[PDB]
Amino acid sequence: GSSHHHMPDNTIQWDKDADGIVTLTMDDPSGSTNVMNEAYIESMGKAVDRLVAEKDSITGVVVASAKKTFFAGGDVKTMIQARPEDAGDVFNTVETIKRQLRTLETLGKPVVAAINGAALGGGLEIALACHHRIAADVKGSQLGLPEVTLGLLPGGGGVTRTVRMFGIQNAFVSVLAQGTRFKPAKAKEIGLVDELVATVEELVPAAKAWIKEELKANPDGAGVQPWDKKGYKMPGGTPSSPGLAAILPSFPSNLRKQLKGAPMPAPRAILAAAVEGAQVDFDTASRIESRYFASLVTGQVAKNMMQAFFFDLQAINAGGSRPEGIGKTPIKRIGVLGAGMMGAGIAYVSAKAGYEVVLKDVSLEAAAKGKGYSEKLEAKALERGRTTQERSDALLARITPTADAADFKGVDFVIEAVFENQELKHKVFGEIEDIVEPNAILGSNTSTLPITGLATGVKRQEDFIGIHFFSPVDKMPLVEIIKGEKTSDEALARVFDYTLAIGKTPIVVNDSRGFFTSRVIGTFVNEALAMLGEGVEPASIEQAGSQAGYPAPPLQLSDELNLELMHKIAVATRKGVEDYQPHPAEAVVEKMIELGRSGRLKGAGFYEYADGKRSGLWPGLRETFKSGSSQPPLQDMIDRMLFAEALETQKCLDEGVLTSTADANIGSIMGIGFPPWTGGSAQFIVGYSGPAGTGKAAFVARARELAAAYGDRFLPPESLLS
Amino acid sequence: MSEEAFIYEAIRTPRGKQKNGSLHEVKPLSLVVGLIDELRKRHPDLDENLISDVILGCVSPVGDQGGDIARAAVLASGMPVTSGGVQLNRFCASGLEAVNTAAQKVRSGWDDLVLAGGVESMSRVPMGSDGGAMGLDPATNYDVMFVPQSIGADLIATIEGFSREDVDAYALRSQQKAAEAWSGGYFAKSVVPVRDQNGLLILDHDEHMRPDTTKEGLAKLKPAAALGGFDDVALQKYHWVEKINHVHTGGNSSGIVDGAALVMIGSAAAGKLQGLTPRARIVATATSGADPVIMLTGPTPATRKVLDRAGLTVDDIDLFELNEAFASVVLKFQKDLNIPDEKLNVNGGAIAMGHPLGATGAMILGTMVDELERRNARRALITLCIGGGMGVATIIERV
Amino acid sequence: SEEAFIYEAIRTPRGKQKNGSLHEVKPLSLVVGLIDELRKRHPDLDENLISDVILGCVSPVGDQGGDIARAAVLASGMPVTSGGVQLNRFCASGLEAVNTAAQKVRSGWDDLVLAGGVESMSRVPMGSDGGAMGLDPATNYDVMFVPQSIGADLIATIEGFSREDVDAYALRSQQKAAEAWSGGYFAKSVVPVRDQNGLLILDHDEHMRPDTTKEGLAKLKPAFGGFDDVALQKYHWVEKINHVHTGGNSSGIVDGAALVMIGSAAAGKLQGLTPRARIVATATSGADPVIMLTGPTPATRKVLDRAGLTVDDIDLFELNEAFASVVLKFQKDLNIPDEKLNVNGGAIAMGHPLGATGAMILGTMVDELERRNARRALITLCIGGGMGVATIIERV
Ligand SMILES: OC[C@H]1O[C@H](O[C@H]2O[C@H](CO)[C@@H](O)[C@H](O)[C@H]2O)[C@H](O)[C@@H](O)[C@@H]1O
Ligand SMILES: OC[C@H]1O[C@H](O[C@H]2O[C@H](CO)[C@@H](O)[C@H](O)[C@H]2O)[C@H](O)[C@@H](O)[C@@H]1O
């Protein structure tokens, strides 16, 4: 019937002390972390029935954990497999889960959560069903509802209870819409947690003490949530309240503004579930939440995002692209060659991770403006309070900006970031390869030059490797490690560990002209320039770029990268093939150079720039390219950009440039800002949804529809054809 | 189709302003009862039992405007209990929609004599007080791309190329032609002054009028419910437009006022039996629509549809009356159909006198009956822009 | 000139008020679901030919405010030229939308029109819109406002209907509604409500208590601010009001929506539509607003005169079961044969969603006329404020 149920191991250890306070300790024996899986659901089922059977001898409940973490996440292996026809089962599972928590909530007696570590997603949903929360203020402990980052939503009462606690607007903005994670200090600050303790060993004693106190001091309110009290008033009002109803129509528009019109259905569903839930009783609200959850799990966006930010990402973090058998090797002193916006950004994220950096340039005047990049960033962090003055001084003191080459002694890690010129790098590497440590890693931040060719300018080619960062280095999370044919599996693994040590994610890439990121983002930019040269309105191109899910529209990105750099890449590719049919963008690139506009570096590009700030599209742009003369459908412009990168990613997978679809997805997402809803430029192929079908087969159908209209470059490779 | 519908009377109250308005103390029911009692004064021997229905438009029918205010007017004023009473809401066109529906009821033949019009006391029931799914429910709001009319109006001016001076020039033209009409006695017989239960005067003129408006004073105003991300939402659909030029202020947009209007409509046989004289004939009506993001371009297709329906062209029409919601909406309509300037809102419009959402359609409908009569002209076309991207138009011929 | 024909008439089930299945469904969704069913039946319909959408709604506030008809047009993806207008004539609002649709089609200035109504009384209770007749004390004191439940009891007092009598009609409505459901009468016209995932929410009328007995109806207590003294001030010859109406012999408070398609014969022929019934006549009348619920009798008389018909010419009579005495009064006035009156049960069993009832019982008779292979049906509702709406349909 309608029960707390529906072979698996028992997950919850039961203990009732001499006072009648039950301690439910969750300890799933199948892994290191308590997961909301079919095993837990069964265990919590039995335990809730028992709390009701022995209700006479029970005065309170405490929920604790035996793992390092409290309770984290759901059974993603199952949710990624739910088809649209499985929506019946999904709805029943989350309703059963919430029926248990609701019974625990209305037990007639206080329930306290003893949060010893990470309480994430389903884990925090368990604690929100309790009447009091206590958190052990320990390192690495986090609390939040990160379901929206996997394309899901807090379906175990997260949306309903947080809205009951904080109101519609605050619960959405602070907790639900972006799945923000909070350290226990910040958690208590916003009302997610109630009180803190120093160590975990104090939790259960402090919980049983709080139950003992609550029963005597508040006898009528024990085990009664604020929203189950008569006369409850939702913070900020209900949707019928006139104050909230005046601003409520702007919540879906403000969200459409933040997401730039991209097809992410998860934040949309969360806002809908929140507002509709706040219109009805708590039990009707939680059922609405179930339907919006099943609406997401059976959808394709959720499967993409679950594949990327869970399976693919965990495969990379676990050393999937790291060579097997190799051992760790510590890093003591980094040496950055060049103090440009890259070398300065490399000097900042290297020192923020605790490493002693030596930052050289061609002059003490330019190396000081380079370390000043780390100072102007440490001032934004002290003004906003994110760092103390003592840790901000220990950070900038590990940077030593110089112009001499002698003070490069003791460096066991060189990340060169000089100009993009081969013999220049051969010179810069030649004059340090012997006065730095003998067997140190030799790294280059080149964006197009083959690492094989650069490796011949040093003697120890086995320690020469590509270590490609992205600007701004402080905010971009990827590190593209380029494996030249002389690089050994140890240097590969050593830079792999260096990337994980500075809080970034590594992909490993075989050596090829353009690598992965630059080559792929080239096809993205060139698709927009071609459209501009075809007479399409620039405002439509930027709108197509923003509405496709990209973090920055293409013509805006074409200013950040120099248009002269693109011309250089095009001359290079033509040199190679001749020793090639040109891309239509190459005429736009040179034409823009001929007019003297080339981007932010020139203060004039597709946009106009007043005293260093971007300000509007260039008005002359429409006359130059006869803009408006071509008006294709917006979705055609959107698909032209997405398909150019997706097709180019398959070419890289075909050529051995990439070794896994995990690296192609996380690489495209974290490196070149490929839209997260796609799950990566490789997932986009197997998870395409359009009018005419869904899957890899429909991707080809749409690929040919685009190839028949805009050029044969949109023709799929054979590896996609059965 | 058989019976022809005729307008027999078309009166209205003065429009009282929103801030410190004279009409703020009058319940919107009493504004309607006042018009009913004037109709009894004009025709004391009218057999009210021949009035089969009372159709009042109302956009925010809550509070003092809820519970079917049309029927409340029927019972309060002492009309026969057989006279019905129904409220309707088609946003800004609810006043003209009540009149079109009354006419269509007469044409079907199953109704004889219908009272029609609207009421809106925006100083007591602010627009939005009724709520609504298109706004307050995020699931469908995210889909219909809801945008306040004030932003679609600015989008119109951005697309067609109407400068701030252009829209302020129309605003001045409206204030001028409204002040000319009032001093020339054009409104003497139709604007029924509002009084209290003692017969003391409350209002006898359109308080919102600023007849001393100057083109320099309009340029001093600041552009204008719109404080979220609505600008970015609109340009997501209108992706070829880079920036929205916010040209609309409180001096070139429709004023927020209280008011009510009544129109008496019946068949040829209906008025003859009661000794009434038909003043105009309802030639044709049409509703259409356009994109609801830029929701105010509705008047253009609805006017074309009513001209093809009545077998007429733009040249055949003597007077055009489009509701002055926003100055750009009128300039667009004028630019689209090449409306001659000397034949457009020739007594001023809502920018000067105000726009009582529920009552405006019947107010400007009755404005053209009097101007057709005063000019001895033949045909007038009345149209309004509607929220949600709708359009409503009506052709009347003088009799 | 033109003749108005009914081409489709569908309705959602009616979910009850306490712990209702539809309580979580926004009323806008109910209407959209019916629009999508019309699409399923006629996928090649040119929706551009739908010139208007006319919905009745007694409480156009909250989830039902802001012209819910236009919201249904945009949310369902219908053409923007399809109009959309809400109207409120209290209980008759649903049928009034259908009448107006027909009269619009007869005038010639509309081609194809959707009409109906929606009322989610569990989300938007009646009275949520306020109203002058109720809340303004000057005009409340002057129209002698009295809730309908008292007028219904007053009707039973004057006409001599006992508690047994009103209860006996209640038992009969439950029996006839249950027999219609089990007979499959409603299979094609009641469209089950589903969620965004296709999971079922409701596929039957939950307010039905088909195991009703005369003994259980007598166990109920009557609904009974001094409105009783107000009524007897006008009906001064009546000494005391006999309070016979309970929740068992009065209309149920439910959620539901109904949709009807109406057009000319030319409009239907252009879209491949087969007409199911013809709108013969409509009439609006009224009676004393204190007793409030005697409007059906004069409205039905007017429409029979206007159509050149009499009681003997009508095969089926369907009057909204607002209260038991209202139907008994109507049956006594016009001497309606018992076997012609509310043959498939009514609002006492299945519920009375204010804005939608008129379009529901209208569609119930289009179906029953086709099933019995009969000719005519007269549909009427008592209206708050003393009004009355009647309509005659003829099968085609
Ligand atoms: O505003 C009414 C229309 O809403 C939807 O269309 C809007 O949203 C679409 C999705 O991005 C856009 O393509 C479209 O341009 C917008 O108008 C709905 O799809 C339409 O059927 C409605 O008419
Ligand atoms: O003033 C109280 C009177 O109330 C009733 O009169 C009203 O009857 C209708 C409304 O119920 C309308 O015609 C109008 O509002 C009143 O005439 C009652 O009939 C009278 O006897 C009372 O004096």
Numbering used by the authors:
A (entry chain A): -14 to -9, 1 to 573, 578 to 720
B (entry chain D): 1 to 224, 229 to 403
C (entry chain C): 2 to 225, 232 to 403
According to the publication:
14 (out of 16) of the characterized MtTFE–fragment complexes involve compounds with aromatic rings [the only exceptions are fragment M-1 (the anion) and fragment B-B3 (trehalose)].
